[PDB]
């Protein structure tokens, strides 16, 4: 029933563990329980969009990142690139689909909060040609991380899944 | 963007707004809504310990801080000072009595989440002499952060709440 009282120095953690940052997500959990505190490297290797019913906080300790987001507040979508430079703080709200584009030799922090009872995450792809939803997978509420891996992998393998229903483009 | 799509450079924000971080209001709120993301300078201390039904994440951008916690896991309490050095990340779990000590020209980030609605925040004072609980107050849900300075003032101005029942030590809301 005892809890950790030992802080972790990011620089030192990085000096020792930066190799633990592995594709296609490049993340590791520094702390868990109530919040998940991730440290993320690059370059990451994905085109998928995360939908998380809770908010997400990004801070770039080193280098810059690209947070592609979709604004769905109004009748039709807005596809926006949010450049988060070194030293940049940014809080993304619940339900905003987002696709972090990460580069080599960069370090970011991502804080997430645990999800309540009935709020499933989703992983979504958009068509490079027409920008309709190509494929959407709802994630089953546990071990999110190995599910966000087995969905990309299953996407990478399923050509009928990678095919836009609308314009019929095969999404690379 | 009916939400913010504009990140904040903390270094540039600091050059611009360093004075916001001065006492008595040493915390500035960079982002709100689901998470409350604060940037916090010093010096700042109070005798009180906060009890958050949810976790608090600390990160020291510049300089170190002192996070005093009570571990209530066993029969006797354990009063631990967690030193959070520059560049340190630390997750504090829910329901851990805690009391942040911040020092002059330091910079911190704190991240907290908006509470469920059925478990309140508490504010608590331990005797400086015998470390027995001297006073505790439950905080209201709807009124966030303003019920705090109201509870410190109330503690400050009531001597019998300020007095330890056990050793009779006159306690304070702040050092000296
Ligand atoms: Ni996400
Ligand atoms: Ni298409
Ligand atoms: Ni607190
Ligand atoms: Ni006492």
From Swiss-Prot, chain B:
SUPFAM superfamilies per UniProt: RmlC-like cupins (SSF51182)
InterPro entries: 3hydroanth_dOase, RmlC-like_jellyroll, RmlC_Cupin_sf
Pathway of action: Cofactor biosynthesis; NAD(+) biosynthesis; quinolinate from L-kynurenine: step 3/3
Localisation per UniProt entry: Cytoplasm; Nucleus
Amino-acid positions noted as binding substrate in the UniProt annotation, renumbered to this chain: 56, 102, 112
Taxonomic superkingdom: Eukaryota
Binding-site residues, O2: 46
Catalysed reactions, semicolon-separated: 3-hydroxyanthranilate + O2 = (2Z,4Z)-2-amino-3-carboxymuconate 6-semialdehyde
Amino acids binding Fe cation: 50, 56, 98
Keywords: Cytoplasm, Dioxygenase, Iron, Metal-binding, Nucleus, Oxidoreductase, Phosphoprotein, Pyridine nucleotide biosynthesis
Binding-site list for a divalent metal cation: 127, 130, 164, 167
Disulfide bonds: none
EC number: 1.13.11.6
Record text on subunit structure and interactions: Homodimer.
UniProt xrefs under NCBIfam families: anthran_nbaC
Note: Present with 2330 molecules/cell in log phase SD medium.
Similarity-based family: Belongs to the 3-HAO family.
The protein's name in its UniProt record: 3-hydroxyanthranilate 3,4-dioxygenase
Source organism per UniProt: Saccharomyces cerevisiae (strain ATCC 204508 / S288c) (Baker's yeast)
Lineage: Eukaryota, Fungi, Dikarya, Ascomycota, Saccharomycotina
Gene from which this protein is expressed: BNA1
């Amino acid at each position: 029933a005892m809890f950790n009282t030992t802080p972790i120095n990011i620089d030192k953690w990085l000096k020792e563990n930066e190799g633990l940052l592995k594709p296609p997500v490049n993340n590791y959990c520094l702390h868990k329980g109530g919040f998940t505190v991730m440290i993320v490297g690059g370059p990451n290797e994905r085109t998928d969009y995360h939908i998380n019913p809770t908010p997400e906080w990004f801070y770039q300790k080193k280098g810059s990142m690209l947070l592609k987001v979709v604004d769905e507040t109004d009748a039709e979508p807005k596809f926006i690139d949010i450049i988060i430079n070194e030293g940049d703080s940014y809080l993304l709200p619940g339900n905003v689909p987002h696709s972090p584009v990460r580069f080599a030799d960069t370090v970011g922090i991502v804080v997430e909060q645990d999800r309540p009872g009935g709020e499933n995450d989703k992983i979504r792809w958009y068509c490079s040609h027409c920008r309709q939803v190509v494929h959407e997978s709802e994630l089953q509420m546990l071990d999110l991380g190995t599910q966000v891996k087995e969905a990309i992998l299953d996407f990478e393998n399923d050509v009928e899944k990678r095919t836009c229903f609308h314009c019929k483009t095969l999404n690379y």
